[PDB]
Amino acid sequence: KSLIIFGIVNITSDSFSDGGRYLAPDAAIAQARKLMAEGADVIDLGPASSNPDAAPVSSDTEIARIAPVLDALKADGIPVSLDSYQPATQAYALSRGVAYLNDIRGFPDAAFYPQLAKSSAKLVVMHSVQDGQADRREAPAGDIMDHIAAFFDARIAALTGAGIKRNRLVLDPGMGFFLGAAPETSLSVLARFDELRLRFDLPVLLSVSRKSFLRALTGRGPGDVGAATLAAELAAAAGGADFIRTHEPRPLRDGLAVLAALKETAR
Amino acid sequence: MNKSLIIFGIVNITSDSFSDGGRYLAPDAAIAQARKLMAEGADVIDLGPASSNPDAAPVSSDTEIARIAPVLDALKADGIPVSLDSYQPATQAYALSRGVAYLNDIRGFPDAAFYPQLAKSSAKLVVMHSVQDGQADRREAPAGDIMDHIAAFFDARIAALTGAGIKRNRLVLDPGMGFFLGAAPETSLSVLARFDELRLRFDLPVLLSVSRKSFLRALTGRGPGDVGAATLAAELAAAAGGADFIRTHEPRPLRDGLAVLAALKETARI
Ligand SMILES: [Cl-]
Ligand SMILES: [Cl-]
Ligand SMILES: [Cl-]
Ligand SMILES: [Cl-]
Numbered sequence: 001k002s003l004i005i006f007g008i009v010n011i012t013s014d015s016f017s018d019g020g021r022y023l024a025p026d027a028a029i030a031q032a033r034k035l036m037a038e039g040a041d042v043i044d045l046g047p048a049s050s051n052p053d054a055a056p057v058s059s060d061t062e063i064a065r066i067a068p069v070l071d072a073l074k075a076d077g078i079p080v081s082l083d084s085y086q087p088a089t090q091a092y093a094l095s096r097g098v099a100y101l102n103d104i105r106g107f108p109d110a111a112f113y114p115q116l117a118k119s120s121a122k123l124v125v126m127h128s129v130q131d132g133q134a135d136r137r138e139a140p141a142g143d144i145m146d147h148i149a150a151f152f153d154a155r156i157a158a159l160t161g162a163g164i165k166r167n168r169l170v171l172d173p174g175m176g177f178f179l180g181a182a183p184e185t186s187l188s189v190l191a192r193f194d195e196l197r198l199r200f201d202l203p204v205l206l207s208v209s210r211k212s213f214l215r216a217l218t219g220r221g222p223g224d225v226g227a228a229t230l231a232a233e234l235a236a237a238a239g240g241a242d243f244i245r246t247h248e249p250r251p252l253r254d255g256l257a258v259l260a261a262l263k264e265t266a267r
Numbered sequence: 268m269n270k271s272l273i274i275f276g277i278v279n280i281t282s283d284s285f286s287d288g289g290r291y292l293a294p295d296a297a298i299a300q301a302r303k304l305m306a307e308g309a310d311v312i313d314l315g316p317a318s319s320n321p322d323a324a325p326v327s328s329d330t331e332i333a334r335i336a337p338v339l340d341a342l343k344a345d346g347i348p349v350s351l352d353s354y355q356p357a358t359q360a361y362a363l364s365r366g367v368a369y370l371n372d373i374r375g376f377p378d379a380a381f382y383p384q385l386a387k388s389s390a391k392l393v394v395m396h397s398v399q400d401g402q403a404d405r406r407e408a409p410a411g412d413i414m415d416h417i418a419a420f421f422d423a424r425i426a427a428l429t430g431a432g433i434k435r436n437r438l439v440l441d442p443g444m445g446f447f448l449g450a451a452p453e454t455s456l457s458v459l460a461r462f463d464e465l466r467l468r469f470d471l472p473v474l475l476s477v478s479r480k481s482f483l484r485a486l487t488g489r490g491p492g493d494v495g496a497a498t499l500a501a502e503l504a505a506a507a508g509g510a511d512f513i514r515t516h517e518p519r520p521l522r523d524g525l526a527v528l529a530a531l532k533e534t535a536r537i
Binding site: 037038039183184187188190191192214217218220225226227228230231232234235250251252253254255256257258259261262263265266 | 452453456457459460461483486487488490494495496497499500501503504519520521523524525526527528530531534535
């Protein structure tokens with residue numbers, strides 16, 4: 001009911017973590033506890049780097065990396081959304097009882113749906129314009145919201161028809177590179193994602209934190225978009241976003257507390 | 268009043284010749300801070316000649332003028348507009364002789380003996396409400412709605428000023444915040460949520476200053492206790508609520524945040 005914050009943790013290496021661009025399972029564990037301490041409700045755990053330029057590791061490598069992280073978060077009572085598009089990793093994560101699966105491919109392979117149907121984990125179904133084609137960087141001609149709605153029309157039908165109950169679904173319309181090169185495309189979705197909540201009567205997750213289009217609206221480099229991110233997340237929250245996936249839970253937590261305190265005053 | 272949001276960057280001179288990169292800024296360090304804040308997106312520098320900490324010993328008007336004179340020199344040469352934030356009439360008089368763009372008085376210009384000097388200047392006037400109202404020990408407004416008490420303050424003070432020859436459109440209304448409103452964070456929250464009532468009742472622009480006010484600390488959680496994120500959220504809320512001016516210690520996060528909200532609004536309108 002209240003905004004749920006996903007804290008981003010991406011395991012980047014098998015054994016060497018240096019507190020910068022390299023994250024190992026031991027230190028992934030410390031980052032997860034730190035993000036919960038800063039106000040996250042869930043750790044959105046990625047078994048590999050987010051950048052498409054790194055060599056994609058195997059489902060076997062993803063499982064080996066997340067296995068010790070899942071043991072300790074389960075011990076801590078720390079909820080996990082397992083962020084992987086690889087079905088063998090998804091199946092392993094479901095066997096460990098994760099709270100969510102988060103698939104940047106949006107669960108496109110119907111042969112896998114019986115395994116999704118027999119679990120209770122919630123599914124973050126993400127839209128992208130790539131849809132499996134790295135070369136495809138834009139949606140088809142027309143209104144981006146029209147194409148996203150039509151994507152979810154078809155995919156929700158496929159998933160729920162296979163027995164995945166619709167109240168397990170969380171809709172992620174995509175953001176930044178998953179929508180197109182132009183900042184206007186991401187701004188349209190950030191402004192209009194509640195059209196999807198209303199169309200489907202389903203919750204929406206957004207991930208805007210540190211996305212490149214924010215740097216276009218500010219003119220600053222990578223380590224200076226903290227305020228633009230907070231403003232974008234607060235605007236999403238005020239627009240009714242049910243989940244926000246972020247790198248820095250504390251500024252968002254603090255900002256939300258101010259907004260909550262203001263509306264409670266005007267009641 | 269229909270123009271875009273105007274940002275005042277806060278710069279206080281807190282020493283005569285001591286600069287430590289932290290709380291103490293001599294005039295040359297205040298010049299460097301003023302220049303930085305405009306580069307970070309301020310439109311005007313709200314320049315205080317002394318510490319705004321109530322536990323600092325107040326300095327004489329002679330000391331205030333000596334501190335601000337070289338800062339006004341430098342900012343005039345830079346073309347940087349100044350709101351001179353001082354409550355001492357002698358300092359205000361000096362600022363007016365230097366042609367500052369605004370005067371900003373935490374006492375709200377309460378002394379009619381000074382009005383003839385206000386009336387023959389062109390400086391815009393930031394008229395600040397406080398529950399102290401000279402009674403510095405007074406910590407709370409009288410019984411009733413705080414917003415009703417603020418409106419009644421501006422009712423009388425606007426009439427007093429405009430009748431003395433100060434044209435109405437020189438006036439900017441600051442309802443006060445934090446200590447100037449009361450001890451309870453709910454009281455500052457009430458003004459932050461409802462100041463639009465003052466814009467409607469007087470048809471005058473409203474200035475808000477929430478930056479780093481202690482009441483925000485009650486809304487941060489457990490942790491180191493940084494207030495920058497809570498400050499930005501309150502300032503963005505004020506902007507969305509129609510604030511004409513925002514006075515802040517950090518213009519850059521606010522400019523960045525406003526640019527996001529503007530692009531979103533433009534997206535929705537088109
Ligand atoms: Cl287990
Ligand atoms: Cl819903
Ligand atoms: Cl201080
Ligand atoms: Cl001059």
